[PDB]
Amino acid sequence: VNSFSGYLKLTDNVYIKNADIVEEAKKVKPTVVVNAANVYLKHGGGVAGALNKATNNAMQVESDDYIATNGPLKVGGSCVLSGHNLAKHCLHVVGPNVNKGEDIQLLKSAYENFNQHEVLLAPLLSAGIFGADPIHSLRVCVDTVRTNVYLAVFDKNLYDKLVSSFL
Numbered sequence: 687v688n689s690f691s692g693y694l695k696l697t698d699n700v701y702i703k704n705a706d707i708v709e710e711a712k713k714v715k716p717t718v719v720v721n722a723a724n725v726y727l728k729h730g731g732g733v734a735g736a737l738n739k740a741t742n743n744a745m746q747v748e749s750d751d752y753i754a755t756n757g758p759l760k761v762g763g764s765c766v767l768s769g770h771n772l773a774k775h776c777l778h779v780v781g782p783n784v785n786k787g788e789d790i791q792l793l794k795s796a797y798e799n800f801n802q803h804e805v806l807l808a809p810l811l812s813a814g815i816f817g818a819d820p821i822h823s824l825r826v827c828v829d830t831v832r833t834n835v836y837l838a839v840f841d842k843n844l845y846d847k848l849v850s851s852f853l
């Protein structure tokens with residue numbers, strides 16, 4: 687039993703809700719919140735900009751030190767950093783950005799990072815400003831993630847379309 691509330695169950699292990707991931711993180715304080723990161727951990731907009739804003743820029747400060755030490759992530763890769771006031775940990779996961787020309791096949795590799803964590807609160811990878819089809823992202827999530835994932839979808843219209851079209 688966990689504290690996630692109001693989710694629709696899609697499969698044995700995947701759950702979905704129309705919710706602001708920032709507000710959901712602040713309420714649940716999950717062990718792991720997933721950020722829709724880029725390789726530079728520059729949290730300017732989309733989910734990343736919103737999560738970072740909620741940390742009063744502490745996420746960005748921590749991230750800049752991480753990059754200075756380790757260099758950029760790989761597309762499809764991830765790193766674990768602090769969750770600040772939102773979660774115990776933040777799993778920064780880089781899905782391919784279609785608006786940059788990145789291989790959409792890397793979306794499966796990106797979701798594989800979730801399997802290193804038993805339970806996660808997450809957005810749909812590569813959705814939103816990353817330019818991929820969210821219906822496809824949900825399909826890859828369900829077919830790749832085996833751990834327990836709670837998906838927060840900000841847009842109500844998109845949430846309804848994802849549920850109604852789910853196979």
Ligand SMILES: O=C(c1ccccc1)c1ccc(CSc2ncnc3[nH]cnc23)cc1
Pocket residue numbers: 705706707708732733736739740741809810814838839840841
């Ligand atoms: O401006 C703030 C703010 C943050 C901290 C403190 C005060 C104000 C803001 C802005 C946007 C959002 C929406 S989060 C989101 N965006 C995009 N895609 C998603 N998929 C799931 N969730 C999302 C929430 C808060």
